[PDB]
Amino acid sequence: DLRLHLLLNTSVTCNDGSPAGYYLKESRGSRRWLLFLEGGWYCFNRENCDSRYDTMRRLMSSRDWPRTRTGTGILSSQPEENPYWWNANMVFIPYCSSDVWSGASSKSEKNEYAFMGALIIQEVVRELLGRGLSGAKVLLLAGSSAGGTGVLLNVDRVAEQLEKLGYPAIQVRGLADSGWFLDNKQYRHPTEAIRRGIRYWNGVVPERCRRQFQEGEEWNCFFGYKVYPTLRSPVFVVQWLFDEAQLTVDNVHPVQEGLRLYIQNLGRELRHTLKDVPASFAPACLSHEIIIRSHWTDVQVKGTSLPRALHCWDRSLHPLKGCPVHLVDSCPWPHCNPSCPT
Numbered sequence: 368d369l370r371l372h373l374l375l376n377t378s379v380t381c382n383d384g385s386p387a388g389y390y391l392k393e394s395r396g397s398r399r400w401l402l403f404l405e406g407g408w409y410c411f412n413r414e415n416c417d418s419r420y421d422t423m424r425r426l427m428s429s430r431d432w433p434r435t436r437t438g439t440g441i442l443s444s445q446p447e448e449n450p451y452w453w454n455a456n457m458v459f460i461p462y463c464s465s466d467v468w469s470g471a472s473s474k475s476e477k478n479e480y481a482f483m484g485a486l487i488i489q490e491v492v493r494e495l496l497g498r499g500l501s502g503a504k505v506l507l508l509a510g511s512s513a514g515g516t517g518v519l520l521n522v523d524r525v526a527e528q529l530e531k532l533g534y535p536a537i538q539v540r541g542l543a544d545s546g547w548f549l550d551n552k553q554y555r556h557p558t559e560a561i562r563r564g565i566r567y568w569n570g571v572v573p574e575r576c577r578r579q580f581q582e583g584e585e586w587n588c589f590f591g592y593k594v595y596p597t598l599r600s601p602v603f604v605v606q607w608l609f610d611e612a613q614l615t616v617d618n619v620h621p622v623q624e625g626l627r628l629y630i631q632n633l634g635r636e637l638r639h640t641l642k643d644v645p646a647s648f649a650p651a652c653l654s655h656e657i658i659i660r661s662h663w664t665d666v667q668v669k670g671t672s673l674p675r676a677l678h679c680w681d682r683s684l685h686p687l688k689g690c691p692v693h694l695v696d697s698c699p700w701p702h703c704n705p706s707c708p709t
């Protein structure tokens with residue numbers, strides 16, 4: 368079990384002004400640290416954040432959080448559930464800022480809600496240094512869905528934070544799961560949502576990407592294939608070719624020719640954006656998230672499981688014979704890979 372710690376800096380808050388926090392299970396014999404960013408969509412104006420506060424309040428507030436969580440998947444401590452990093456120090460950071468982890472704006476007389484995702488990550492890192500993180504060899508910043516996009520937005524800032532504090536020896540790396548979206552045509556008539564959100568949240572993006580797209584165009588940096596080439600930290604990208612969230616925002620729900628072509632073109636476009644991503648795992652399945660799911664060990668691409676691919680990645684950061692790191696399916700239709708989640 369992982370134990371809850373509310374942030375000592377109570378100015379770093381969830382949407383409703385309650386303190387943010389993190390769940391921690393230490394492994395005293397390990398210098399590996401895993402910091403996981405939870406996902407769960409977002410909200411981008413007053414009325415839709417009000418709706419979210421009514422029936423999704425744990426994503427907006429710490430008032431009802433439990434004192435413990437069970438670590439699952441890559442956060443599990445048993446070797447049988449987690450062949451990759453079972454002995455690591457484990458941290459689960461709950462998503463209570465509704466801003467895809469980009470915000471830096473407090474609740475005030477002008478703002479009903481606080482959007483502090485980027486500041487929550489920085490404060491969790493600061494407080495953990497006094498609990499063992501100062502001795503780390505690797506800090507892996509991981510996340511699913513909105514948390515996967517959050518990895519892309521924040522991994523270089525964590526690296527810069529530790530360098531400025533005097534820790535040049537901690538290697539910061541990223542693992543982005545189900546956070547690699549496309550700004551494509553809908554099937555029946557995201558960019559506008561993100562454009563709205565950035566202004567409402569006072570959202571922040573990585574510096575080099577911001578310098579390319581410039582003012583008013585920062586929304587471009589929420590799309591993996593645009594922001595990834597600007598990053599300096601090593602990032603492993605896990606992405607279903609037919610992600611259910613992508614199909615949802617594309618307004619896709621006996622498949623006729625028009626829809627068949629749309630789905631096939633979406634898979635081919637996703638595969639194209641990953642061609643030059645050297646650490647990636649992209650199966651041809653219709654699904655959503657993987658890395659903290661209990662059965663994340665079951666799926667395979669070209670005969671290699673995801674825990675194995677991540678182990679091969681670790682070795683490459685010390686090509687490897689029989690231990691690949693770039694794994695992208697080529698078959699063109701959902702569940703053409705027999706190991707897809709049922």
Ligand SMILES: *[C@@H]1O[C@H](CO)[C@@H](O)[C@H](O)[C@H]1NC(C)=O
Binds near residue numbers: 376378379486
């Ligand atoms: C608390 O967090 C805020 C916002 O990130 C920061 O400006 C401030 O310096 C922090 N205070 C302390 C005592 O760490």
Ligand SMILES: N#CNc1nc2ccccc2[nH]1
Binds near residue numbers: 512513546590
């Ligand atoms: N939910 C969730 N995560 C998410 N949705 C996106 C839409 C566009 C660009 C990046 C995105 N990340």
